[PDB]
Design a protein around this ligand. Structure first.
Ligand SMILES: Nc1ncnc2c1ncn2[C@@H]1O[C@H](COP(=O)(O)OP(=O)(O)OP(=O)(O)O)[C@@H](O)[C@H]1O
Ligand SMILES: [Mg+2]
Lengths: 49, 97, 69, 146, 244, 233, 199, 48, 241
């Protein structure tokens, strides 16, 4: 919701009257899938990464 | 403003542990790993990767006994083994943002 | 005022509650609440979205203080 | 990597540590290069350098018991001439809390006591005085209150 | 200032240069060591306790793992923390309660039986000779002239009267869920209360329970005895909360 | 079980200071603001009540206790240490009342409560108490306001503050206190000088007030305080 | 004073009379000498009025503390043993005839006599006090093994009615109490309900 | 990171009298006066 | 640093370290298993013989705490014999004042509460000793409790203590036991012991067993010699096969 959605349809946020958020922090105890999660994003979003 | 989201990825839950095990255990040849509920019940404190270990360990007992398949004990032992060293091997603390 | 409002925002509730936040934190609240409207496919924001947005980024930063002094 | 206080920290070993943590995970996981890591104070390690994905199977070394000591001394004796007098069963029970490094040292010391005495064989008496030597023990010359 | 050490001050219970007792700020971290959470909700006719019950094995008997203790006949309470310290403080409650009845002849109010658990804890704060107990008692019980009541007393002493509290791992998360259901305000019948308690614990942990995963202690004004609900009665409320 | 330690933990430093009492005074200065104002026919003891949700029941505890028919306390600092001193005071008052059949004078009670707090800076294996008591009382025709410190000292005041921002409040009081006030401001002026250190909106269940006139000490009912909070009374 | 406890199958039937003499002046003519020790265990205090009260209270204090630590309805034999320990240690100071009888969930109704000395013995029916002397015959002829709750509530009435005609330290109303698994059915006989044997 | 710098130097000394490194034929004296302080892995036979 | 020198010191973590260590002194002892069936309790100790010089079947780890209450211990043995006397002393003051054999639910809570009083002060050292109390009565059935250094007691259907705590809890989970007569359990216990023992880490062992159940009429004994042999023959056969 912070990577794809407002990278495709920025207009949805101008109608509300805000600006999409710039940047996520994945944090949490080791081994829980923080790198695997970005691995999944990189396989799919289709743009420079 | 600089970083707008604080996504906290937490330790797996009851459903979760199960889904991860099922994702990992799938590729293992077997005769019916039917007791997932004791496995999920013992595997507390297990993070995504430590369930990835359990499914391997269960494999290793098979390679040791020289089977071409695992069984329901292989995954029962592996959870006891991993769970001993996981507790032994240093305490993990939550670091909030 | 630059975004869509509720019929009743009661911004006075969200000014009283906490007791230390920045001009950036605030601007982040509104960004979040609005962003909850985009999930809900609603044009404007609502009085519930702006209450979860305030607990998401502000109340998160509010921890435990010992209650015996 | 638990340091964080704002004045000191080190924050140098830590970075080249986080390089090691992204050679065991991230990117392509290395599957053609195994990693054996040895330490003797596993308690001061960073949790992110244990769990699975890094050090997976964790072998503890238990400090030899009685039977192991007997095989450990008997392994370093073969290099030299020992009488058939020696009784490894007894020596092993004689030592206690010894490591493979100390049992090793015993044989070393026995041979050193046979070098001084002027013989070429180890008797059961040399090993007994080696144990007294390689065993930490201060010069307590009041040990006459039995 | 700013956290400095007075040498000894993290090993006994004496003031730091800041103006705090590091030894008591630690004994609170024991409560969360337990790993359990307990909610308590006050109605207008009844007070409810609901506790997560975690049987780790198939070996442990399930009827001797409980956290709900009968202190009087009109005072229950739930113990969170180090299980050893807990049982040690419950034993001490029962003693005071029955010592009270023996000296004054009208069984003890829930008010005072906390005030005494609180003051015993306070001594362990003030001396260096021992640590404080690492647990946290929540008492409930019907008062003869103020309706039902809920009290919670901490390892330091400070104890207070509540409308809804929690204690343990999700002690912050719960009190954010509860205070929303308190400023709205309802009738708070007997079925209202049990409803608010289970749905709070069930959502903050995400479990959605089986009757064998919670124990529910409750005390009504019609019948002031402290019951612990069996699995049969607990299930009637869980499938009623799955409908609604 | 145990025996107990025997050696004092309050010790002199090379300075000539008793570091433990110096620190226990810094705990006092973390506590909730409290003001005291001797009138000319009563004493007012007002205090910023503690709470941090809407779940707390703001009538199950009291920061303004009665010690006797003619005595009162509020405190500033650790809440457990306050229930200990309130309880050793109420017993002191009852030994005094049991021997002379006469309510304990207020000069007396403060001088004894202080000697209990002095005992914990020179006893084995204890830390000093973490509170300052403000003791009002009205005996022998007059009002009295005292204040004992975790040290053990005590000073009669004509009006004072303790707790958080007690240097701003002693200044604010220094000007606004002109003797010969009526009892009813000391309330008004007291409540004002809580406000010079309090952030938020004051209500009838958020502060606690106690007066102390010839008729005897009494805590003010919630209704009663709501009226003085017309900020005009 | 006379106190009496009989044992039938469901439970027990206690019976006392109300009159605390102090020499030849009567101090209280409606005294309650059937004291609840717990929920289904009663004691009948006789002998020194001030000694028994202290002991009774002291056993309640221990017995109630004791039942909450086990979470079980205490046994009658337990609340007996506690009077036994009490009356024997202080057999110099005191002077207390007790009669503990109650209904147990695992031994039936029971009656235990604890006389002046601190002896303890179980009995089918017991009988004590100062007026008990005068009814050892009537109570030995008329009792037969096996009764119903309705043959006992009339039995003790008749007994305590004889013991009040002859003793001087007995009189007033009769208090009975039937203790069964059900609960406790306390009743008072006064005026004409008190059986009569005049001749 | 107390003494984390000095400590790491010692691990290097330890490591070169006991690692894999067979090592030539060099003897080693160590004269302390406070042996109570030396790390156990520095003290045990086969290095001293 | 200085959070382990005292039982009276929480650590910053949140946990008393001196109790942690005690429990690790248990883990370095031989293994003892308890297993409660529906009409008795059977006890099993894996007593190592460290020389051929100790007399056979002597210096047991199976106490009688009362005439109907076994106590099988693991951990540092000196402190064990100390508890076994505090417990005998409690289960005597209870028969004195209340006049009837003490109920095991209570004897446990009282011996745990006594262990707990030793983790509070700095003037004493927490016991290095976990142990199980078994018991049988005809008004309460079999009950089996287990205490540890912390001062925690928990009802159990089976449990184990000592250096093979993990391997033995498996064998009992893979065993039905709410349906077996006492007589059948003893065979299981022997078989479980033999499995969990390593003769590549220890020399040999003597197998100690204890009834307490319907067989003996609510007393607690040690299993008679003949039935002990039968349980050792049926245990070598399940290791052959
Ligand atoms: N939530 C999960 N679901 C499925 N698999 C997982 C999950 N978490 C971890 N794994 C498995 O564990 C392996 C390693 O976990 P991963 O590297 O994602 O943890 P991490 O959070 O990046 O660790 P660190 O915090 O040390 O960087 C992955 O390759 C994956 O197969
Ligand atoms: Mg990662």
């Amino acid at each position: 919701e912070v990577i794809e959605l407002p990278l495709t349809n920025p207009e949805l946020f101008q109608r509300v009257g805000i600006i999409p958020p710039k940047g996520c922090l994945l944090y949490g105890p080791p081994g829980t899938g923080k790198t695997l999660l970005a691995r999944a994003v990189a396989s799919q979003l289709d743009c420079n990464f | 403003g600089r970083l707008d989201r604080k996504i906290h990825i937490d330790l797996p839950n009851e459903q979760a542990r199960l889904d991860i095990l099922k994702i990992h255990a799938g590729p293992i040849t077997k005769h019916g790993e039917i007791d997932y509920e004791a496995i999920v019940k013992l595997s507390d404190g297990f993070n995504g990767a430590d369930l990835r270990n359990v499914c391997t360990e269960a494999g290793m007992f098979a390679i040791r006994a020289d089977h071409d398949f695992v069984v329901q004990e292989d995954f029962m032992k592996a959870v006891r083994k991993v769970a001993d060293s996981k507790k032994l091997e240093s305490k993990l603390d939550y670091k909030p943002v | 005022s630059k975004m869509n409002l509720s019929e009743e925002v009661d911004l006075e509730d969200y000014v009283a509650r906490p007791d230390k936040i920045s001009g950036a934190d605030i601007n982040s609240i509104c960004q979040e609440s609005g962003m909850l409207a985009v999930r809900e496919n609603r044009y404007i924001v609502l009085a519930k979205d702006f209450e979860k947005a305030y607990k998401t980024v502000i109340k998160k930063d509010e921890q435990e203080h010992e209650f015996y002094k | 990597k638990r340091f964080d206080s704002e004045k000191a920290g080190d924050r140098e070993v830590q970075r080249t540590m986080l390089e090691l943590l992204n050679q065991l995970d991230g990117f392509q996981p290395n599957t053609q290069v195994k990693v054996i890591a040895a330490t003797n104070r596993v308690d001061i390690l960073d949790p992110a350098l244990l769990r699975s994905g890094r050090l997976d199977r964790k072998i503890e070394f238990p400090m030899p018991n009685e039977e192991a000591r007997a095989r450990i001394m008997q392994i370093h004796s073969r290099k030299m001439n020992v009488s058939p007098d020696v009784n490894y069963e007894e020596l092993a029970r004689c030592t206690d809390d010894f490591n493979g490094a100390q049992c090793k040292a015993v044989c070393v010391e026995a041979g050193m006591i046979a070098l001084r005495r002027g013989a070429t064989e180890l008797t059961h008496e040399d090993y007994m005085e080696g144990i007294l030597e390689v065993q930490a023990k201060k010069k307590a010359n009041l040990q006459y209150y039995a | 200032s700013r956290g400095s050490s007075a040498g000894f001050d993290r090993h006994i219970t004496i003031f730091s240069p800041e103006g705090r007792l590091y030894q008591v700020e630690y004994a609170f971290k024991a409560i969360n060591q337990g790993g359990l959470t307990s909610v308590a909700v006050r109605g207008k006719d009844c007070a409810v306790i609901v506790t997560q019950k975690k049987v780790p094995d198939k070996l442990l008997d399930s009827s001797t793992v409980t956290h709900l203790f009968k202190i009087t006949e009109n005072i229950g309470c739930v113990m969170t923390g180090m299980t050893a310290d807990s049982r040690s403080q419950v034993q001490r409650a029962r003693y005071e309660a029955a010592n009270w009845k023996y000296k004054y002849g009208y069984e003890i109010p829930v008010d005072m039986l906390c005030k005494r658990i609180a003051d015993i804890s306070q001594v362990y704060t003030q001396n260096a000779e021992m640590r404080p107990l690492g647990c946290c008692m929540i008492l409930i019980g019907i008062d003869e002239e103020q309706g039902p009541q809920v009290y919670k007393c901490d390892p330091a002493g400070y104890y207070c009267g509540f409308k809804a509290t929690a204690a343990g791992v999700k002690q912050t998360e719960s009190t954010s869920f509860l205070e929303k259901k308190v400023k709205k305000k309802f009738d708070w019948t007997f079925e209202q209360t049990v409803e608010t308690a289970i749905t709070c614990l069930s959502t903050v942990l995400s479990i959605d329970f089986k009757p064998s995963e919670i124990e529910v202690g409750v005390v009504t004004v019609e019948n002031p005895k402290f019951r612990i609900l069996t699995e049969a009665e607990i299930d009637a409320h869980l499938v009623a909360l799955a409908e609604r | 079980a145990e025996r107990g330690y025997s050696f004092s933990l309050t010790t002199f430093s090379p300075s000539g200071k008793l570091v433990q009492i110096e620190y226990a005074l810094a705990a006092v200065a973390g506590g909730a603001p409290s003001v005291g104002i001797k009138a000319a026919n009563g004493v007012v003891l007002a205090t910023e009540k503690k709470q941090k949700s809407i779940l707390y029941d703001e009538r199950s505890v009291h920061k303004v206790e009665p010690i006797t028919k003619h005595i009162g306390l509020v405190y500033s600092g650790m809440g457990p240490d306050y229930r200990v001193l309130v309880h050793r005071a109420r017993k002191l008052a009852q030994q005094y009342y049991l021997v002379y059949q006469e309510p304990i004078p207020t000069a007396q009670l403060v001088q004894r409560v202080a000697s209990v707090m002095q005992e914990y800076t020179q006893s084995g294996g204890v830390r000093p108490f973490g509170v300052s008591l403000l003791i009002c009382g009205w005996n022998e025709g007059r009002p009295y306001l005292f204040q004992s410190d975790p040290s053990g000292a005590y000073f009669a005041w004509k009006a004072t503050a303790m707790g958080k921002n007690y240097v701003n409040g002693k200044t604010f009081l220094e000007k606004r206190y002109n003797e010969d006030l009526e009892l009813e401001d000391a309330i008004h002026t007291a409540i004002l000088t809580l406000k010079e250190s309090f952030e938020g909106q004051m209500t009838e269940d958020n502060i606690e007030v106690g007066i102390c006139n010839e008729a005897g000490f009494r805590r003010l009912t919630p209704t009663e305080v709501k009226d003085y909070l017309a900020a005009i009374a | 004073t006379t106190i009496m406890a009989v044992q039938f199958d469901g439970g027990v039937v206690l019976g006392a009379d109300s009159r605390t003499t102090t020499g030849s002046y009567i101090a209280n003519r409606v005294t309650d000498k059937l004291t609840p020790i717990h929920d289904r265990i009663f004691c009948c205090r006789s002998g020194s009025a001030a000694d028994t009260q202290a002991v009774a209270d002291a056993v309640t204090y221990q017995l109630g503390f004791h039942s909450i630590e086990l979470n079980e309805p205490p046994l009658v034999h337990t609340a007996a043993s506690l009077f036994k320990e009490m009356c024997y240690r202080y057999r110099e100071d005191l002077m207390a005839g007790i009669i503990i009888a109650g209904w147990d969930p695992q031994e039936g109704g029971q009656v235990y006599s604890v006389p002046m000395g601190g002896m303890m013995v179980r009995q089918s029916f017991a009988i004590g006090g100062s007026g008990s002397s005068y009814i050892y015959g009537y109570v030995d002829a008329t009792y037969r093994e096996g009764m119903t709750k309705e043959e006992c509530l009339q039995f003790t009435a008749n007994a305590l009615a004889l013991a009040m005609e002859r003793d001087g330290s007995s009189g007033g109303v009769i208090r009975l109490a039937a203790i069964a698994e059900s609960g406790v059915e306390r009743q008072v006989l006064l005026g004409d309900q008190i059986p009569k044997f005049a001749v | 990171g107390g003494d984390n710098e000095v400590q790491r130097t010692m691990l290097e000394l330890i490591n070169q009298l006991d690692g894999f490194d067979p090592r030539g034929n060099i003897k080693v004296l160590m004269a302390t006066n406070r042996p109570d302080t030396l790390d156990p892995a520095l003290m045990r036979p086969g290095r001293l | 640093t200085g959070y382990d020198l005292s039982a009276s010191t929480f650590s910053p973590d949140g946990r008393v370290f001196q109790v942690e260590y005690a429990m690790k002194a248990v883990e370095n002892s031989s293994t003892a298993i308890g297993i409660r069936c529906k009409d008795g309790v059977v006890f099993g100790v894996e007593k190592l013989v460290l020389s051929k010089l100790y007399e056979e079947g002597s210096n047991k780890r199976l106490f009688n705490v009362d005439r109907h209450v076994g106590m099988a211990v693991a951990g540092l043995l000196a402190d064990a014999r100390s508890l076994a006397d505090i417990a005998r002393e409690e289960a005597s003051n209870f028969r004195s004042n209340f006049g009837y054999n003490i109920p095991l639910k209570h004897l446990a809570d009282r011996v745990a509460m006594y262990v707990h009083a030793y983790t509070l002060y700095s003037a004493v050292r927490p016991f290095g000793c976990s142990f199980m109390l078994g018991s049988y009565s005809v008004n309460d059935g079999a009950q089996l409790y287990m205490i540890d250094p912390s001062g925690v007691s928990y009802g159990y259907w089976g449990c184990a203590i000592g250096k093979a705590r993990q391997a033995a809890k498996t064998e009992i989970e893979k065993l039905q036991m709410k349906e077996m007569t006492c007589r059948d359990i003893v065979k299981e216990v022997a078989k479980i012991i033999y499995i969990v023992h390593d003769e590549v880490k220890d020399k040999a062992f003597e197998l100690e067993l204890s009834w307490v159940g319907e067989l003996t009429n609510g007393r607690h004994e040690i299993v008679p010699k003949d039935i002990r042999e039968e349980a050792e023959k049926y245990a070598k056969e399940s290791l052959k096969e």
